[PDB]
A paper describes a structure:
Calcium/Calmodulin (Ca2+/CaM)-dependent serine/threonine kinases (CaMKs) constitute a family of 81 proteins in the human proteome that play a central role in cellular signaling by transmitting Ca2+ signals. Kinases in this protein family are activated through binding of Ca2+/CaM to regulatory regions that either flank the catalytic domain or are located in regulatory molecules. CaMKII proteins form large oligomeric structures. The N-terminal kinase domain is tethered via an autoinhibitory helix and a calmodulin binding site to a C-terminal oligomerization domain that organizes the enzyme into ring-shaped oligomers.
To address this, we determined the structures of all human CaMKII isozymes in their autoinhibited state. The structures were refined at resolutions ranging from 2.25 Å (CaMKIIγ) to 2.4 Å (CaMKIIβ). Importantly, whereas the crystallized constructs of the α and β isozymes contained the catalytic domain and the inhibitory region but only a part of the Ca2+/CaM binding motif, the constructs of both CaMKIIγ and CaMKIIδ additionally contained the entire regulatory region as well as a part of the unstructured linker to the association domain. The C termini of the crystallized γ and δ isozymes extended well beyond the Ca2+/CaM binding site (in CaMKIIδ, including the linker region up to S333). However, the autoinhibitory helices in all isozymes were structured only up to residue 302. Different crystal forms were observed, containing one (CaMKIIγ), two (CaMKIIα and CaMKIIδ), or four molecules (CaMKIIβ) in the asymmetric unit. Similar to the C. elegans orthologue, the substrate binding site is blocked by the regulatory domain in all human CaMKIIs. The activation segments were all well-ordered and helix αC was correctly positioned for catalysis as indicated by formation of the conserved salt bridge between E60 located in αC and lysine K41, which is a hallmark of the active kinase conformation. All four CaMKII isozymes were crystallized with ATP-competitive inhibitors that are relatively non-selective. The alpha and gamma isozymes were crystallized in fusion with the His6-TEV tag.
Author numbering: -8 to 0, 5 to 23, 25 to 302
Write the structure that this text describes.
């Protein structure tokens, strides 16, 4: 009744027996490597976690990530296919996503308008809305974690990396700690105030701003000054690039980039916003070449730093 009760969570050799390990894709605690299941042949991405070292707190964080990934089955979230416990290592086996970052694919297009921005943000908000409904907060929405499923026509945007995700109690806010990425951090996390689901919508507003113009609404080289701007919601819509952006897109950005999280738009309401919801009649169809060029520089900057 050990293996009968624990089942797929019981210690085993399921990974070593049923999969072959191939190259490293990334690294950070853990490594993500491509792998191929033998029995019915298919490609996956195994996150590999060395468990010999781990503290009680790190086990809880690993179990949390595993649980959260198991729970989330949505076309715009990268699916966990298995969670395998072996003697010294744990393996989270995910779908392999081969289309690369969303932001990289955008700069490679012939045409790119608001209507394409809205289409991306529609998919991104569907994933955020899904996780919020399941009382999960991602806490680290950013370009690096918005991937395309495949290089194929019509590939979905997929949310990745729930390494920082938290489970919340319905709509209750608490101090869950200082986590996230500088440029996308919410005022409430910087204030050290209680928080929850709204923090992910703040991040979506920053992403949405970048999808429209190709540069971030908040930046300073001095991180103390960056954080002051974010707390003050010190962004704007400079001309000339913002002059051709529809007032509807601007409206959605303002609602997402609202300092007080209680007043900030929800994912569910953002999905009912006309620019998202009635994209076809509301979103502009004019190509935004200046956005593609800024995005190129935005991607290069990030690549040059990493
Ligand atoms: C090309 N590719 C696909 C994936 C990937 C992938 C993940 C992509 N990320 C985000 C990591 C964002 S690179 C960063 N700067 N941080 C993950 C974090 C934790 C577990 C898995 C993944 C996933 O779920 N399926 C996949 O195919 C991946 C993961 C790490 C590095 C490259 C990579």
């Amino acid at each position: 009744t050990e293996n009968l009760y624990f089942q797929s969570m019981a210690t085993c050799t399921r990974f070593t027996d049923d999969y072959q390990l191939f190259e490293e894709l990334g690294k950070g605690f853990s490594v993500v490597r491509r792998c191929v299941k033998k029995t019915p042949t298919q490609e996956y991405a195994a996150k590999i976690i060395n468990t010999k070292k781990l503290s009680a707190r790190d086990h809880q964080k690993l179990e949390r990530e595993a649980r959260i990934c198991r729970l989330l089955k949505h076309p715009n979230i990268v699916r966990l296919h298995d969670s395998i416990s072996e003697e010294g290592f744990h393996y989270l086996v995910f779908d392999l996503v081969t289309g690369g970052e969303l932001f990289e694919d955008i700069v490679a297009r012939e045409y790119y308008s608001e209507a394409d921005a809205s289409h991306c943000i529609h998919q991104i908000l569907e994933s955020v809305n899904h996780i919020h409904q399941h009382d999960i907060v991602h806490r680290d929405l950013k370009p690096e974690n918005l991937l395309l499923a495949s290089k194929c026509k019509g590939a979905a945007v997929k949310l990745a990396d729930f390494g920082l995700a938290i489970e919340v109690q319905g709509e209750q806010q608490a101090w869950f700690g200082f986590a996230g990425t500088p440029g996308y951090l919410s005022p409430e996390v910087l204030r050290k105030d209680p928080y929850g689901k709204p923090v992910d919508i703040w991040a979506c507003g920053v992403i949405l701003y970048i999808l429209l113009v190709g540069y971030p609404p908040f930046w300073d080289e001095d991180q103390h000054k960056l954080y002051q701007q974010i707390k003050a919601g010190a962004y704007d819509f400079p001309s000339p690039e913002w002059d051709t952006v529809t007032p509807e897109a601007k409206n959605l950005i303002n609602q997402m980039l609202t300092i007080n999280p209680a007043k900030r738009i929800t994912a569910d309401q953002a999905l009912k916003h006309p620019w998202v919801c009635q994209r076809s009649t509301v979103a502009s169809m004019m190509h935004r070449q200046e956005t593609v060029e800024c995005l190129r520089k935005f991607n290069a900057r990030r690549k040059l730093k990493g």
